[PDB]
């Protein structure tokens, strides 16, 4: 269901169409049990133009590959190899993100 700022709480599918430098975001995590979280949205890049991904989204999967326990490098290489049309399953977890990034 919708959380308190109208972002779904449940895992949700976001389709990104890649740009010249990539997908337009950056990630943290992938170590010591922390999952892969979006930490940055590049202005005017694909993720920003889509408008759906948020800082504090956990990337659960990319093109059908589970990244819940993947390393940071494994997640980065998966994004790089995901092609021109990238299917992300994201789950918005602002509070958990803040606990890991504090």
User: For residue 39, how many other CB atoms are within 10 A of its CB?
Assistant: 15
Q: Beta 57-62 vs 65-66: how paired, if at all? A: antiparallel
Way the structure was solved: X-ray
Burial class from Cβ neighbours inside 10 Å (0-12, 13-18, 19+) for residue 7 reads: middle
- Radius of gyration of the chain from Cα atoms? 13
Cα separation, 45 vs 102, whole angstroms: 27
The 3 state secondary structure assigned to 28-70 is EEEECCEEEEEEEECCCCHHHHHCCCCCCEEEEEECCEECCCC
Identify the CA nearest to 56 among candidates 87, 30, 92.
92
Could you tell me the two tokens for 75? Answer: 């997640």
Could you tell me the two tokens for 61? Answer: 């999967």
Where in the chain are the domains?
A: 1-102
In angstroms, this model's resolution equals 1.2
Half-sphere exposure of 32 (CA within 13 A, CB side): 4
Q: In 21-93, which ranges are continuous DSSP H helix?
A: 46-50, 72-80
């Amino acid at each position: 269901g919708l959380g308190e700022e109208d972002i779904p709480r449940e895992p949700r599918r976001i389709v990104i169409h890649r740009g010249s430098t990539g997908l337009g975001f950056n990630i943290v995590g992938g170590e010591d049990g922390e999952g892969i979280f979006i930490s940055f949205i590049l202005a005017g890049g694909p993720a920003d133009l889509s408008g759906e991904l948020r800082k504090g989204d956990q990337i659960l999967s990319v093109n059908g590959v589970d990244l819940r326990n993947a390393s940071h490098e494994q997640a980065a290489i998966a994004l790089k190899n995901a092609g021109q049309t990238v299917t992300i399953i994201a789950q918005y977890k602002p509070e958990e993100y803040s606990r890991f990034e504090a």
